[PDB]
């Protein structure tokens, strides 16, 4: 009886094993576009992914994770609200059963079909496991997906999903360029929050891009053919792996743009 997204183990249950679920800086949140304040002191965001080294893709039973070599400064996030250098370690998505839900953040209560999280850790803490113990340990770049035109830079991900259908399966995933998943604009909202899965640690600087990327219906359909279960277990489609919006409490969402 471990955590997940079902009726019996989903987000309303997590607080029993992870009491920080009801904490002061939980994620995701609703982004109220009329309450977020433009902050002219926010520096521009620096996404430096030209030397990114992807290694592997893994079905972890919750989502699929594309992992990078983070043993040197090869793909880094800097600037915006961040002090110092954050190294890309992995990305993953959250998505829905239907096009009208799937994102974790919402924008004026609007739910997108999916959300991409590009996870980075603060290199002043030396490794990812130390960085998650610090209030400024992580920076997650959140990008919304809407269903429309295909995203060409997503298709290499979609085409490998058949090879990692079940929990615990991995596949070699070299030479993938995460620059193909970005929208044109790097305009963003930022706030202090948490991991959106157990252990729900309050270690994240959230940077959520305003502009969604477009993916095709056929692209998201292939996400929804994944399984939460292991090989040889009863099939449970990997859908609706999103945590809903948490109370904003004593926090301010800042906008990089007027
Ligand atoms: C979609 O589901 C995901 C996605 C990511 C991960 N994470 C890791 O597996 C890691 C690592 Si690694 C050294 C085995 C490559 C991150 C994670 O679990 N962080 C906690 C932790 C604590 C100590 C040591 C290691 C990890 C984590 C990171 C970001 C988020 S999110 N959704 O962006 O807020 C959540 C969890 C977990 C799940 Cl269940
Ligand atoms: Zn996530």
Local structure of residue 160 (DSSP, 8 states): H
Local structure of residue 4 (DSSP, 8 states): -
CA distance 44 to 79: 6
- Contacts of 36-39 with CB under 8 Å at 24 or more apart are 36/189, 36/253, 36/254, 36/255, 37/252, 37/253, 37/254, 37/255, 38/254, 38/255, 38/256, 38/257, 38/258, 39/254, 39/255, 39/256
Give yes or no for a contact between 234 and 167, defined as CB atoms under 8 angstroms apart.
no
CA distance 115 to 131: 23
Whether the CB of 198 sits within 6 Å of ligand 1: no
Q: For residue 74, give both structure tokens.
A: 């090869």
The residue whose CA is least distant from atom 26 of ligand 1 is 129
Please name the residues in contact with 194: beta carbons below 8 A apart, sequence gap of 6 or more.
20, 23, 25, 26, 27, 200, 201, 202, 203, 204, 246
CA 16 to ligand 2 center in whole angstroms: 21
3-state secondary structure 221-238: HHHCCCECCCCCCCCCEC
Q: How far is C-alpha 28 from the chain's CA centre?
A: 10
Please name the residues in contact with 16: beta carbons below 8 A apart, sequence gap of 6 or more.
none
Q: Structural domains in the chain?
A: 2-258 (3.10.200.10)
Instruction: Using the atom order of ligand 1, give the atom closest to the CA of residue 140.
Output: 33
CA 93 to ligand 2 center in whole angstroms: 6
CA distance 250 to 11: 22
CA distance 67 to 57: 6
Q: For residue 158, give both structure tokens.
A: 């979609």
- Among the bound ligands, name the one nearest to the CA of residue 64: 1
**Residue list, CB under 5 A from ion ligand 2:** 117
CA distance 168 to 107: 33
What SS3 state is found at 240? coil
Instruction: Tell me phi and psi for residue 189, to 5 degrees.
Output: -105, 150
What SS3 state is found at 125? helix
Give yes or no for a contact between 107 and 115, defined as CB atoms under 8 angstroms apart.
no
DSSP 10-24: STTTGGGT-GGGGSS
CA 231 to ligand 2 center in whole angstroms: 24
* 2 noted as active-site residue: no
Whether the CB of 79 sits within 6 Å of ligand 1: no
Beta partners for residue 91, in sequence order: 66, 118
In testing the pocket of ligand 1, which one of 59, 115, 197, 198 has its CB within 8 Å of the most ligand atoms?
Answer: 197
CA distance 190 to 203: 14
Number of H helices, E strands in the chain: 3, 15
Picking from 29, 148, 126, 6, the residue whose alpha carbon sits closest to that of residue 73 is 126
CA angle in degrees (0–180, nearest 5) for 190-93-246: 50
Q: For residue 197, give both structure tokens.
A: 């899965």
């Amino acid at each position: 009886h471990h955590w997940g997204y079902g009726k019996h183990n989903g987000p309303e249950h997590w607080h029993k094993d992870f009491p920080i679920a009801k904490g002061e800086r939980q994620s995701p949140v609703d982004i109220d576009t009329h309450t977020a304040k433009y902050d002219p002191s926010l520096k521009p965001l620096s996404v430096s992914y030209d030397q990114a080294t992807s290694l592997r893709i893994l079905n972890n039973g919750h989502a699929f994770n594309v992992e990078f070599d983070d043993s040197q400064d090869k793909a880094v996030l800097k600037g915006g609200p961040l002090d110092g250098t954050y190294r890309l370690i992995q990305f993953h998505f959250h998505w829905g059963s239907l096009d009208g839900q799937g994102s974790e953040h919402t924008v004026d209560k609007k739910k997108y079909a999916a959300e991409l999280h590009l996870v980075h850790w603060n290199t002043k803490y030396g490794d990812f496991g130390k960085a998650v113990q610090q209030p400024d340990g992580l920076a997650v770049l959140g990008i919304f997906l809407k269903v429309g035109s295909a995203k060409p830079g997503l298709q290499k991900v979609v085409d490998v999903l058949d090879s990692i259908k079940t929990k615990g399966k991995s596949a070699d995933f070299t030479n993938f360029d995460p620059r193909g998943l970005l929208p044109e604009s790097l305009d963003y909202w930022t706030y202090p929050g948490s991991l959106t899965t157990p252990p729900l640690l309050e270690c994240v600087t959230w940077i959520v891009l305003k502009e969604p990327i477009s993916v095709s219906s056929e692209q998201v359909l292939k996400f929804r053919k994944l399984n939460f279960n292991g090989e040889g277990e009863p099939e449970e489609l990997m859908v609706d792996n999103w945590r809903p919006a948490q109370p904003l409490k004593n926090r301010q969402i800042k906008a990089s743009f007027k």
